Amino acid sequence: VTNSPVVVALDYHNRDDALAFVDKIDPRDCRLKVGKEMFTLFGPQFVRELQQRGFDIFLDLKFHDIPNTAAHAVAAAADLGVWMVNVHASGGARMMTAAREALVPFGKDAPLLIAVTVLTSMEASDLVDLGMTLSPADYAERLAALTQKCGLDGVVCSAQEAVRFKQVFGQEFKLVTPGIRPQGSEAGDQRRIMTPEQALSAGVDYMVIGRPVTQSVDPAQTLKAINASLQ
Ligand X SMILES: O=c1cc(O)n([C@@H]2O[C@H](COP(=O)(O)O)[C@@H](O)[C@H]2O)c(=O)[nH]1
Detail the residues annotated as belonging to a binding site for substrate: 11, 33, 60-69, 120, 181, 190, 210-211
Cα gap 60→36, rounded to integer Å: 7
Task: Report if residue 146 touches a copy of itself, rule: CB under 8 A.
Answer: yes
Helices (H), 53-157: 67-80, 93-103, 124-127, 136-149
Using rule CB under 8 A, residue 113 touches a copy of itself: no
Stretch that binds a copy of itself, among 50-58, 182-190, 197-205, 221-229 (CB under 8 A): 182-190
Are 137 and 117 in contact by the 8 Å Cβ rule? The answer is: no
3-state DSSP assignment of residue 57: strand
Question: Is 149 tagged catalytic?
Answer: no
CA dist 160 and 157 (Å) reads 8
- Which residues between 149 and 168 bind a copy of itself (CB under 8 A)? none
Judged by beta carbon, residue 48 or residue 53, the one nearer a copy of itself is 48
Is 18 a residue that touches a copy of itself (CB under 8 A)? no
Note whether 122 and 69 are within 8 A (CB). no
Asked if residue 8 binds a copy of itself (CB under 8 A), the reply is: no
Cα→Cα distances 225→8, 37, 162, Å: 13, 26, 23
Residues of this chain that bind a copy of itself (CB under 8 A): 11, 13, 35-45, 59, 61-70, 72-73, 75-77, 79-80, 88, 90-95, 98, 119-122, 126-127, 129-132, 134, 139, 142-143, 146, 178, 188-190
Active site residues: 62
